[PDB]
Amino acid sequence: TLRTYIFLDALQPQLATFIGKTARGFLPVPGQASLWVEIAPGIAINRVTDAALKATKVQPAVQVVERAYGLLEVHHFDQGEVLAAGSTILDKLEVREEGRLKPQVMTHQIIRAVEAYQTQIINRNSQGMMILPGESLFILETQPAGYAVLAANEAEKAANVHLVNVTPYGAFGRLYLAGSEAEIDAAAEAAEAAIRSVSGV
Amino acid sequence: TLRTYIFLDALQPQLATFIGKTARGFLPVPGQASLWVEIAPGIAINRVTDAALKATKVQPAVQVVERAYGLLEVHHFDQGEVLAAGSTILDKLEVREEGRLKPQVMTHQIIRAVEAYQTQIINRNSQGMMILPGESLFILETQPAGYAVLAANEAEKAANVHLVNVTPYGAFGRLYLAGSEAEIDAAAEAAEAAIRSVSGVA
Amino acid sequence: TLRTYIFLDALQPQLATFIGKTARGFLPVPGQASLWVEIAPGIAINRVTDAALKATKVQPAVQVVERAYGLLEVHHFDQGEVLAAGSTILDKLEVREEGRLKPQVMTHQIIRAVEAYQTQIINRNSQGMMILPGESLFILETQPAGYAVLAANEAEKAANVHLVNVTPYGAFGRLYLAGSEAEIDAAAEAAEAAIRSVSGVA
Amino acid sequence: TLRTYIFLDALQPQLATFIGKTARGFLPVPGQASLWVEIAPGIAINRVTDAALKATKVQPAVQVVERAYGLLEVHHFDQGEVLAAGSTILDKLEVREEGRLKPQVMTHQIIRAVEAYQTQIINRNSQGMMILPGESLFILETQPAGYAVLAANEAEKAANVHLVNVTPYGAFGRLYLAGSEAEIDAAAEAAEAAIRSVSGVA
Amino acid sequence: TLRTYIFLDALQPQLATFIGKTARGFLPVPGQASLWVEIAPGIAINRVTDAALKATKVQPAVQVVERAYGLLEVHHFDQGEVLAAGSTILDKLEVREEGRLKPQVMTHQIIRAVEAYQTQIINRNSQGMMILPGESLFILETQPAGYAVLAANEAEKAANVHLVNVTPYGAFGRLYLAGSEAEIDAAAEAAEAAIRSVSGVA
Amino acid sequence: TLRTYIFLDALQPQLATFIGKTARGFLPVPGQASLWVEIAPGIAINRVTDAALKATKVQPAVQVVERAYGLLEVHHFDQGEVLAAGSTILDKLEVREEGRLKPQVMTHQIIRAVEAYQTQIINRNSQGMMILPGESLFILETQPAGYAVLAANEAEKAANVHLVNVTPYGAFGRLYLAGSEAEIDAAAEAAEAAIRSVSGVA
Amino acid sequence: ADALGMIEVRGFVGMVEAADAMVKAAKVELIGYEKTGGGYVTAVVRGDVAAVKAATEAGQRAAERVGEVVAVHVIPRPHVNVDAALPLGRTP
Amino acid sequence: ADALGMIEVRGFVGMVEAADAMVKAAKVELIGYEKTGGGYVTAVVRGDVAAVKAATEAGQRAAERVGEVVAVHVIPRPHVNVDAALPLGRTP
Amino acid sequence: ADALGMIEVRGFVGMVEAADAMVKAAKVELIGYEKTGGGYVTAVVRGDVAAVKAATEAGQRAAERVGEVVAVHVIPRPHVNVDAALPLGRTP
Amino acid sequence: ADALGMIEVRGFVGMVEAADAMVKAAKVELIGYEKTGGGYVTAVVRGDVAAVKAATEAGQRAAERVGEVVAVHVIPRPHVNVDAALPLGRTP
Amino acid sequence: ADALGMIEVRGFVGMVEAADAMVKAAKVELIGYEKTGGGYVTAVVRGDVAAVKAATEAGQRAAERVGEVVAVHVIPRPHVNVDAALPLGRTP
């Protein structure tokens, strides 16, 4: 059951840096074309990874067999190689581009002027950049989970924010973005437009 | 969606110590009033935390984004600040006291004279005080998970027990309590009376 | 609520080694008879553990209270002692042999000649033995989770493979096996025949 | 070079619980005679452990192979078996009883009525029981680090305390104890009278 | 023997955020006056911490008893309260202001246009903000280790850089700063001019 | 000061797998020429890494700035590229080939027929392949710590054993190998012939 | 009943430092202070026997640094006629 | 159960003055006395450890005035096998 | 059957501290105490020879701090006539 | 199973005095005796390891005075294949 | 079939220590023992060739401590006529 299929054209610097900090695999560098596949059940993603690696010469970074599901990331400098790996992944699953689920948006909010007491909690439980007291915050949950990296890529692509934390796998993909208020507002507009501009089921 | 809203009059010593051991935030001291809010979906708890911290001068300890849910603890020495924070929390969600889910008691057992082979497993996978071999054990699961801290507060308040483990977040909130037989019996009676005295939506 | 009850007559060496590596409890050695009980809710497995330890002199290795469920392992050198512990476990739950859930086989695939880029990810994310590049991989998911130890036990018993990983607790029990092509094929035949030979509730 | 050879003739309950919570190998149950061996250098402890296991029936729990201090714990019900394992360990090391170092009480402090702000740091960085605010705290550093378990054993054997933490390894041996005032005073007196009454060569 | 005694009169925000991320205790907020005491030997810092907490209103975050040293951090909004805690700590240690070791800049090295192959190893072994590929890196080690937070405080106070990782405890105090070229040059100039201008005993 | 400079001209599969499991960087695959550099002091290895990455097409996996030492592992398919990175690292350090310390085997023990109680402690404290009970064990320590990977590489290159654990960094370089008796004898002979046939400063 | 703990310092400053250090170092209750004239003021804490034994020896050790301590004494059980006739804060 | 304290005086007179001062100085229970013959008698008090450490240290000084104190010792936690086989007042 | 262990202390105080340290250090059975008059009492533990050899080395070590130990001895196998004629607790 | 104690004396007189002193000085069980010919006989006691370490050191001390002791050795845990192959009295 | 390992000790006690150390240090089978008179008993282990070479040199080193080792030999392939006539525990 295909839950998420998104093709990132080029990884932004903070997104590639966060993926290389938090992944378990061949870590990406900024500027590479990426791909994210999340299927159900969680162990057939090994077969998906093997199909992609037998077809193309992409390198995988995130391949996490989760509680119920499984997310795969593959990447290469060539968009043609990454799209060929994606076509092989879709041909192995016997589905197409529209077999994925359309990402629901559970909660999107912009928190103005986050106090110090909340920032200490938020970036004790983060893995990327630190949010400072007084800076704004954008939160975002997407079901299925694999679209939060799409939101992070298209949010950093159109603004100047801090990727605090993104959880690309699990029940709900989450997203923490920090920065000034106009930049958080533009990043929130870009991220919501990028999530709502994806077809699915 | 409000799942848990429980107000604690005063944190007992072992409960405040366990929360300061296992919390991610500003640790509580004993004697402080407390407030546990668990909502769904688990990222709006940041908006709830921001509302409470803009309103009052309370200090937060536990704010854990779970797989599907989100918990919040705030605390302050004065009870009026914590109650005003709770009123601001309920106004942000536009719900009331009774909008919370009424907690089910899905397991309550008093395991008496626990052998060494079981105690070593139990307090290999706990954080609080260590249950000894031969002592008793009270177990508890409450759904939603945010009422296990109410059970731990009102169970330590009425007996002399060891808080072996409490887990206020997840699909089921768990509670481990050790001590002598009659004191575990009194704490079990107090905790079962405390969870069943909570109004809410079934 | 019973979900899994499987009696292992003898732990194979790699399975006993993996359980002693990744268990929180008294470590099993090879040659011992094992027993795996997984019930719901997650905290009544403490009562099941106490019942087994008060009845017999069996010794527990895995007693994991999961999010929504709870797993139990007990073991001893004597199959009669382990089966008496199992009889007391089934008498405490007031259920029978067939009260367990019949395990579904939700995915079984033999991935032959696994590339290096996949093996590095797999045995970065495993605890047991390591898969090398070029070796075949057998993967398996069973629902409920407690039958993956039966799958691993019989698959090592009828072949010569490497137990890369097995996760006997959770929503889905997983199994990773590595080795040569014919031996992965024989282990796959043995595991797929050993899971489907389990009676119980569909 | 033999540093620490101590024979714990009876594991007290909180000490056995702490060893089972922080143990690596086959964790013990109380009432067992234990035996701690720490040598220099720290790679010879595998041959020592193998000699003890081929000689006797003992079961090892703590066997740490760190920088050049090799710690080994073995235990069994039978004190004869534990002394036989210790004799085989001393024969395989080709040393005697008195080749161990005489233990050295370095720093013994009793901190009366510890505030809450310090207890959160103390038992956020502990493994055993929790120190509650207001309770007295006894800390202890001994040299070599392997005699801290004798200190914890006799300190629990005398007075009714809480074993907060004890570090049997490293360059120095920690011991954190918590309770009331007179009980911590009696435990500190017994631990000091048990450490420096041990024969050895400084 | 007192090694480090530095009084951070105002915590800058990224330094306060990093201390709250990596501290075991009561987290500081930006604007508070902080203090750092590092002594040798180690476990006397418990009595030092208790003396400071009984004297003043201060509220500690980093209190790490270490393999050979011991570090303490206390902080409060009132700079007079923090300085009175420092005077109490100096009186309990029976030393004065100038008894601290004068810090020594060992290795200041500016690495420019750090390639993406290296940034992942830099930040995977860090806790604070991530270094982006192409940004300059400043590394710094001072002896004693407790003055690295002074270097981090003054480097954030002068220039506009990202704090990657500061390690105030150990044999030497690391400091990783990221940012653009002129800003790393200004922050390095401020850190050099802030460390070597501290009066002490060499 | 150059402690360890060894050029692994081909990574064997289990060594490449262990490095991919325990590396904080970009993972290697079998067949690549590796290169290990260990220096003193510990933080010059960042400038060394920068120089190597700006010079050549190599890709780093292990780069650990430890308590006192610093390690670096670069690797690429082209052995000329890896030797050019080695020449760049030597020219940045301003040392030569023979400035490395000559590695000395400190301990070479074979612990044939390891009983299960020792196996569980060995493989709970390891990352590589599991050791099964009854199999032989080869422990090894080399000084400096970086030559243990050369020992593991040549030992897997000659015989057919299981790699249990190797420690490339620290004061001592450990190596645990498991297999049958003749295979462990062959791997021990090959690793001993690998270590002491390396020139350098005594 | 509750055990009795007394510090007598010639001087009001040395008594308050004693009365501050006794209630910080134990769970005792400072009930008041007695002014017997001549510069002698006397602090009284009153808790159980294990705490007042550690409070006063942390009260005497803290009050010798600032003043002149006259007498320090710990009564483990004062008689019920002592508390009923003398002002020690537990008068029935 | 409770903490165990003992005063052994060679002579019945110094034992009772030890026993009279122990029950007055702290809240203990004089459970009895053990004649061992040859002029030795042992007064046994049994309360919590904060009181019996203060009772027997005051009961010794009252018995060093009139008698001949042989041994003073306080056991804070006597084992449950001691309380069943020896007469210390807590035999089940 | 069981091995025999004995501590003899001139005084009831040093015998109970001997009897406390024996039953805490091993899995023995304190069967009683023998009063041969003149100020002598004899604590008798009786278990297996693994335990009573290590119990009475703890009973000797603790009673020498608090008294005058007369004699410490362990019999690994007492004869069938000794237990049937002397009061050692295992008389059939 | 149980531990294994052995005294080998060149001579039947020195074996029986070795065998009699082992079963008196500890709680062991003399399972038999092995006649390997040429003057060598071996007394085999077999009990727990705390007794067979005390018995065979008392069997040797009594046999060196009357005979010629060849070998004394105590096996604390003999392997299960040794008791299945060699006649030690615990053959299943 | 399987390889053949032998320890010959002048004395029964040094053989059992040899026969115990061989089955612990490898996966071998102690098939029996041969009493050829004069006090020459001989332990025979029999397993695969890499283990019996490690069993005997762990049994030779262990039997020289307590006995008189006469001969040690390991046969990698004993011929099928040897196993049919001589009693090596694999008689067809």
Side-chain angles (χ1 to χ4, degrees), chain B residues 47-68:
Chain B
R47 187 179 68 247
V48 169
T49 307
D50 182 74
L53 292 174
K54 293 290 179 65
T56 62
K57 293 181 182 179
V58 299
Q59 195 179 5
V62 176
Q63 191 271 119
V64 175
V65 176
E66 204 262 333
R67 177 176 170 87

Short mmCIF file of all heavy atoms in Angstrom, two decimals, chain B residues 47-68:
data_model
loop_
_atom_site.label_atom_id
_atom_site.label_comp_id
_atom_site.label_asym_id
_atom_site.label_seq_id
_atom_site.Cartn_x
_atom_site.Cartn_y
_atom_site.Cartn_z
N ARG B 47 0.74 25.17 20.82
CA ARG B 47 -0.14 26.34 20.88
C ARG B 47 -0.76 26.48 22.26
O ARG B 47 -0.87 27.60 22.79
CB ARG B 47 -1.23 26.22 19.81
CG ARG B 47 -2.09 27.45 19.67
CD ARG B 47 -3.13 27.27 18.57
NE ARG B 47 -4.14 26.27 18.92
CZ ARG B 47 -4.29 25.10 18.30
NH1 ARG B 47 -3.48 24.77 17.30
NH2 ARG B 47 -5.23 24.26 18.69
N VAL B 48 -1.13 25.36 22.87
CA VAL B 48 -1.67 25.36 24.23
C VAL B 48 -0.63 25.83 25.24
O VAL B 48 -0.92 26.64 26.14
CB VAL B 48 -2.21 23.95 24.56
CG1 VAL B 48 -2.54 23.82 26.02
CG2 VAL B 48 -3.44 23.66 23.72
N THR B 49 0.62 25.37 25.07
CA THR B 49 1.71 25.79 25.94
C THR B 49 2.00 27.27 25.79
O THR B 49 2.23 27.97 26.79
CB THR B 49 2.96 24.97 25.62
OG1 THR B 49 2.64 23.58 25.67
CG2 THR B 49 4.07 25.26 26.61
N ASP B 50 1.97 27.77 24.55
CA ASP B 50 2.19 29.19 24.31
C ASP B 50 1.10 30.04 24.94
O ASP B 50 1.39 31.09 25.52
CB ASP B 50 2.27 29.49 22.82
CG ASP B 50 2.54 30.95 22.55
OD1 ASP B 50 3.69 31.39 22.75
OD2 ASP B 50 1.61 31.66 22.12
N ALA B 51 -0.16 29.60 24.84
CA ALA B 51 -1.27 30.33 25.46
C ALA B 51 -1.10 30.41 26.97
O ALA B 51 -1.23 31.49 27.57
CB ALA B 51 -2.60 29.66 25.10
N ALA B 52 -0.75 29.28 27.59
CA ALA B 52 -0.57 29.25 29.05
C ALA B 52 0.61 30.11 29.49
O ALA B 52 0.53 30.80 30.52
CB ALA B 52 -0.39 27.81 29.52
N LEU B 53 1.71 30.11 28.72
CA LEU B 53 2.88 30.88 29.12
C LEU B 53 2.73 32.36 28.82
O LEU B 53 3.37 33.18 29.48
CB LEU B 53 4.12 30.32 28.44
CG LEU B 53 4.55 28.93 28.92
CD1 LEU B 53 5.71 28.43 28.08
CD2 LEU B 53 4.92 28.98 30.38
N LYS B 54 1.90 32.74 27.84
CA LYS B 54 1.60 34.16 27.67
C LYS B 54 0.65 34.65 28.74
O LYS B 54 0.75 35.81 29.16
CB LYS B 54 1.00 34.43 26.29
CG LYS B 54 1.95 34.22 25.13
CD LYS B 54 3.02 35.26 25.08
CE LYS B 54 3.95 34.98 23.92
NZ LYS B 54 3.26 35.11 22.61
N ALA B 55 -0.28 33.81 29.19
CA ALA B 55 -1.21 34.24 30.22
C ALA B 55 -0.52 34.39 31.57
O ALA B 55 -0.45 35.49 32.13
CB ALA B 55 -2.38 33.26 30.33
N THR B 56 0.01 33.29 32.11
CA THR B 56 0.44 33.28 33.50
C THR B 56 1.95 33.14 33.61
O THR B 56 2.67 33.06 32.61
CB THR B 56 -0.25 32.16 34.26
OG1 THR B 56 0.13 30.91 33.69
CG2 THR B 56 -1.75 32.30 34.17
N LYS B 57 2.42 33.10 34.85
CA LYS B 57 3.83 32.93 35.17
C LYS B 57 4.15 31.51 35.59
O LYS B 57 5.10 31.28 36.36
CB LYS B 57 4.24 33.90 36.27
CG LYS B 57 4.20 35.36 35.86
CD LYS B 57 4.63 36.26 37.00
CE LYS B 57 4.55 37.72 36.61
NZ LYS B 57 4.95 38.62 37.73
N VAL B 58 3.37 30.53 35.13
CA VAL B 58 3.64 29.15 35.48
C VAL B 58 4.87 28.66 34.74
O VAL B 58 5.31 29.24 33.74
CB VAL B 58 2.43 28.25 35.18
CG1 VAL B 58 1.23 28.71 35.99
CG2 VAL B 58 2.11 28.27 33.71
N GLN B 59 5.44 27.58 35.24
CA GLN B 59 6.68 27.05 34.74
C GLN B 59 6.43 25.64 34.23
O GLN B 59 5.82 24.83 34.94
CB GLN B 59 7.73 27.04 35.86
CG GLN B 59 9.15 26.84 35.43
CD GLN B 59 10.10 26.87 36.60
OE1 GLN B 59 9.67 26.95 37.75
NE2 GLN B 59 11.40 26.83 36.32
N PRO B 60 6.80 25.31 32.99
CA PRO B 60 6.47 23.99 32.44
C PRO B 60 7.57 22.95 32.61
O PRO B 60 8.76 23.24 32.47
CB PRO B 60 6.24 24.30 30.96
CG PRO B 60 7.13 25.46 30.70
CD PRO B 60 7.18 26.27 31.94
N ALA B 61 7.16 21.72 32.90
CA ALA B 61 8.09 20.61 33.07
C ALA B 61 7.99 19.58 31.96
O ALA B 61 8.97 19.34 31.24
CB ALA B 61 7.86 19.91 34.42
N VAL B 62 6.83 18.97 31.80
CA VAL B 62 6.63 17.88 30.85
C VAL B 62 5.85 18.45 29.68
O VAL B 62 4.74 18.95 29.87
CB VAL B 62 5.88 16.71 31.48
CG1 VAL B 62 5.60 15.64 30.45
CG2 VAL B 62 6.66 16.14 32.65
N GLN B 63 6.43 18.39 28.49
CA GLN B 63 5.69 18.70 27.27
C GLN B 63 6.24 17.74 26.21
O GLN B 63 7.22 18.04 25.53
CB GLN B 63 5.83 20.16 26.88
CG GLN B 63 4.90 20.62 25.77
CD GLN B 63 5.49 20.45 24.40
OE1 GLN B 63 4.95 19.73 23.57
NE2 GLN B 63 6.58 21.15 24.14
N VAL B 64 5.58 16.59 26.09
CA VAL B 64 6.06 15.47 25.29
C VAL B 64 5.10 15.27 24.13
O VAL B 64 3.92 14.99 24.33
CB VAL B 64 6.17 14.18 26.11
CG1 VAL B 64 6.54 13.02 25.22
CG2 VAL B 64 7.20 14.35 27.21
N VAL B 65 5.62 15.40 22.91
CA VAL B 65 4.86 15.08 21.71
C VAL B 65 5.01 13.59 21.47
O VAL B 65 6.09 13.10 21.13
CB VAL B 65 5.34 15.89 20.51
CG1 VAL B 65 4.60 15.46 19.27
CG2 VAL B 65 5.12 17.37 20.75
N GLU B 66 3.92 12.85 21.65
CA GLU B 66 3.92 11.40 21.56
C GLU B 66 3.73 11.04 20.08
O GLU B 66 3.84 11.89 19.20
CB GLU B 66 2.87 10.85 22.53
CG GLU B 66 3.01 9.42 23.04
CD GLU B 66 2.16 8.43 22.29
OE1 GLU B 66 1.12 8.84 21.73
OE2 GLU B 66 2.52 7.23 22.25
N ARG B 67 3.47 9.76 19.78
CA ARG B 67 3.23 9.34 18.41
C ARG B 67 1.95 9.96 17.85
O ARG B 67 1.93 10.46 16.72
CB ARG B 67 3.15 7.81 18.34
CG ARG B 67 2.83 7.25 16.97
CD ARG B 67 2.88 5.74 16.99
NE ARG B 67 2.36 5.14 15.77
CZ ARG B 67 3.09 4.91 14.69
NH1 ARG B 67 4.37 5.24 14.67
NH2 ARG B 67 2.53 4.35 13.62
N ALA B 68 0.88 9.95 18.63
CA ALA B 68 -0.38 10.51 18.18
C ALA B 68 -0.94 11.59 19.10
O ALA B 68 -1.89 12.27 18.71
CB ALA B 68 -1.43 9.41 18.02
#
